[PDB]
């Protein structure tokens with residue numbers, strides 16, 4: 460990188476009910492789009508979880524009269540975005556919260572690791588992407604933690620060999636989605652991750668929700684010693700442990716949520732609740748663009764650095780990030796020499812001044828301008844190999 464990352468996860472399932480297509484991305488604000496998620500088999504095989512979303516869906520300008528074997532779906536739409544935004548890199552993300560059960564097996568043998576790297580890189584180079592993001596939630600012991608390093612080294616080795624043959628001098632990126640909870644990150648080979656990876660996407664959110672005994676801030680920076688029940692976690696303790704454990708500050712990208720977590724039948728922050736209630740798309744989760752809801756007021760914990768809405772009438776509390784929160788988090792990350800901002804996920808953002816991703820772009824100042832790759836001479840898709848020319 461030659462500047463800060465401003466990266467966003469784009470979900471392939473967002474093309475359905477959320478109706479958020481790659482052309483809806485405000486691409487001018489983004490250095491990296493992390494395309495989520497590929498699924499994984501126990502033998503290391505990386506697979507599409509949705510071939511329609513990935514490469515079959517025909518958009519308005521996609522013709523069934525094209526000759527040969529061609530890519531459509533989000534793959535062609537993202538290649539269009541890359542052409543129009545030469546500073547924007549697209550990463551292939553594998554796993555995620557719901558598809559991490561097969562990682563231990565996938566990383567467990569030389570054969571499975573070689574099959575993971577080959578199948579992942581096959582998608583990357585056929586689809587015209589710039590790298591790979593591993594989202595293993597989460598390595599659970601020392602065997603898994605060390606096998607995770609062996610898997611990353613196999614992917615790095617195969618990426619370099621691929622570039623040597625089919626993109627000489629291009630550096631394909633290798634990243635992970637990393638846990639903010641010490642119970643998980645204490646198990647990782649932090650010094651090894653610091654050496655092998657381009658970036659660690661720190662998932663500095665999901666600190667409180669339905670899994671909590673009490674309500675709490677979802678993504679606060681600091682502990683609040685005068686209301687510690689509101690801050691079961693804090694980002695700052697995680698960031699310091701990652702750097703001191705051997706991850707260089709500039710490789711850490713600070714994850715921020717474009718959604719809020721709701722608690723029902725509660726008095727306030729750091730208190731008892733009964734149930735998380737409804738959501739935008741799933742129980743207890745609200746898209747940022749739906750917040751704050753009518754009848755709720757937003758209050759700031761200036762010690763924990765966290766905003767939340769409360770509706771006295773409905774006894775509903777929602778923890779979420781505001782533009783001011785992004786400005787505070789960007790000042791924080793710059794103060795520690797971190798690599799930039801990451802967002803989960805693109806579809807829920809507001810447009811214009813109130814955009815969290817746009818707020819971050821403006822607060823960061825100087826973004827990574829490293830050029831993406833448009834040359835895929837070994838793609839099995841004739842339109843990708845021809846650069847959609």
Ligand SMILES: CC(=O)N[C@@H]1[C@@H](O)[C@H](O[C@@H]2O[C@H](CO)[C@@H](O[C@@H]3O[C@H](CO)[C@@H](O[C@@H]4O[C@H](CO)[C@@H](O[C@@H]5O[C@H](CO)[C@@H](O[C@@H]6O[C@H](CO)[C@@H](O)[C@H](O)[C@H]6NC(C)=O)[C@H](O)[C@H]5NC(C)=O)[C@H](O)[C@H]4NC(C)=O)[C@H](O)[C@H]3NC(C)=O)[C@H](O)[C@H]2NC(C)=O)[C@@H](CO)O[C@H]1O
Nearest residue numbers: 472475476555556557594636640662665670692740741744
């Ligand atoms: C400090 C500490 O230790 N805290 C612990 C805490 O971390 C733990 O909570 C977990 O944390 C991790 C981070 O560490 C979370 O995982 C990351 O963060 C994001 C946001 O949470 C994750 O995002 C979720 O990702 C899953 C997929 O993995 C999403 O699942 C999708 O759900 C939708 C439904 O909304 C499905 O969509 C439908 O799809 C069909 C077709 O397939 C379509 O036809 C429909 O129209 C479509 N429509 C709708 C309306 O949905 C979709 O199929 C499915 N996709 C898949 C692949 O299953 C889910 O929606 C995302 N959640 C939010 C919110 O956006 C993300 O996985 C991961 N990021 C990365 C980069 O890895 C994790 O979410 C969180 N867990 C929980 C349960 O919240 C907790 C655990 O208990 O413990 C604390 O101690």
Ligand SMILES: [Zn+2]
Nearest residue numbers: 475476477478
């Ligand atoms: Zn539907």
Ligand SMILES: [Zn+2]
Nearest residue numbers: 630633656657
């Ligand atoms: Zn590198």
Ligand SMILES: [Zn+2]
Nearest residue numbers: 820824825826
């Ligand atoms: Zn700029």
